[PDB]
Design a protein around this ligand. Sequence first.
Ligand SMILES: CC(=O)c1ccc(O)cc1
Ligand SMILES: CC(=O)c1ccc(O)cc1
Lengths: 331, 331
Amino acid sequence: ALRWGIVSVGLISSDFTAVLQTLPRSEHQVVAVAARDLSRAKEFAQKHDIPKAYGSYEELAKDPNVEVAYVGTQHPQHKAAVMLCLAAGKAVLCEKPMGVNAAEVREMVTEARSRGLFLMEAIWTRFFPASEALRSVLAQGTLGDLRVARAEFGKNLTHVPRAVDWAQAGGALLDLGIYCVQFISMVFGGQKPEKISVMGRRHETGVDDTVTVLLQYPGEVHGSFTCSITAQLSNTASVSGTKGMAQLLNPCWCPTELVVKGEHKEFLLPPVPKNCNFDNGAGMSYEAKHVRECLRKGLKESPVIPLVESELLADILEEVRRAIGVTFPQD
Amino acid sequence: ALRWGIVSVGLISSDFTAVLQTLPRSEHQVVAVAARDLSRAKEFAQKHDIPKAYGSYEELAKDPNVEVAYVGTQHPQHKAAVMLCLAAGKAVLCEKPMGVNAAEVREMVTEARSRGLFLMEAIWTRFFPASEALRSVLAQGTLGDLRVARAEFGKNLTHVPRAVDWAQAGGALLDLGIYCVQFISMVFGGQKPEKISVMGRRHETGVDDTVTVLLQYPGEVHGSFTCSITAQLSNTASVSGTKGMAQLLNPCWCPTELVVKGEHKEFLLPPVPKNCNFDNGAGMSYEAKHVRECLRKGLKESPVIPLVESELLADILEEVRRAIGVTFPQD
Ligand SMILES: CC(=O)c1ccc(O)cc1
Ligand SMILES: CC(=O)c1ccc(O)cc1
């Protein structure tokens, strides 16, 4: 079994741990959990049936029983936790966005690379059967030559505390834009944009509110997206070429429906678990299964989200928020 | 009755004439028609029950029986036909886009203004009950403070001859972009953009293929749209603020469905006529009825599409196609 250690005990670690505990037991075991104090960790481990509990991440890094660490901390805390894990020899699945700016990402990627160890950013959307089916449509030429891609993700998240906090690097871009960038990047082969234009505005709590971006891609195709922490959007993503459009329906960040040239196709979520903190949370299984296959083949990264692309996604996102003046201390 | 004269006898003049012939007969009469030769005009007049037929537009301009002229010619032929009508004292409803660049529009607007005569661009979408209801939602503050608007209109139109012809000023912008610009302008009070960014590409026949535009509007809100003559898009338009989204469903350029915060509302088309050349063609009635009310109150323009806005829409569109290098002889 792939032996997992869970770093941090917040909402998203719950969902992930819960998902992992539904997988075949000869395939995945949750073996440890760390929090920033011992009691918060004993409670999670009791609630989630994990044999070992730690009051620091370093102690989990050092557990010779953990093979892969899941880093589910909040945005600014990923980098130091990932590095601890990599130094101690663990493969790492890091929550999104892997880092707060590009230099954090290069620094994690370089460590992983130099230590010969697996690192992946948990852009879970990529492993949903509906996204896979979309990649297959693109590979097959079904839409003809491509022309334009589009993504949207906005909700009123102003009452979701850590969504709007300057000190947690929240904001529309880092919470929701990341899904738009990864989608656009995916449809255009992970290629580097030739040019980016941005418009948006700020929110009163120190983060970004609403941001639209235009990306010029090679070969004369382009994307645009819009994200927001105040305005509801349609929350779909599309790609179109000379023979038609393919579209991931709302919710595009955890999609279960693909529409290709008018034809609908549904891809159901696993049955369990059922009361996840975040919607469609059961879909976290797809990436969990993905990390296991990669490790089993001895890969040091995912071909589906390669480290060199995580770096590009972080370059793009930082260029976007620099265009509208939004800075974090880490820059 | 408002006595109409029909300039040009192509597909769109058919639809319009057909619509006019369904209106209360004490409200509208079609009294003449002109074409570039007498036979093409006698045939249309026979087919459409119009008492008088002309082999030049000048002869229709000069008919003292016509009160308002409908100029349904192709893009490059609007300006000379409108001017003939205005010189001869007729009110004019001119098909979209009124002109091929901004100078054509200013020149028509100036003539209309100096002669004390009604001119309107036939942006028919604006008079659809669903668009009216959308304006009302905006006026009521139902979406909260606004944030962002979005529009799309693309279809494969490469087999529609005049859509892709350099010499008819076709292209994505002038055939479909115009609907996106007018929508975006409508949602933001007809205000002038602070800034525009454009990406797109050309089509092999001398026109534009696929174009996306980002418009910065005052008060820290923005729009984006995408149009295309090769790629199918979702063909919807939306606007969102802090309390939700309103959306005109496909087909957004002649909409019958409005979705506001999840709540659907349908607005049926008039019953007749039924086999129009263009979809939802029956909806041309709304603008026809609009021209009559304006003339009855003695207006020299529409408050719904004022001449000063037609000029701004033409400025925007020309700036957009100049950004990607697409020029017509008239520039
Ligand atoms: C921010 C985000 O990814 C998210 C996802 C699911 C929710 O139910 C609420 C918020
Ligand atoms: C280009 C356009 O406005 C249009 C409208 C309706 C159609 O059925 C086909 C094309």
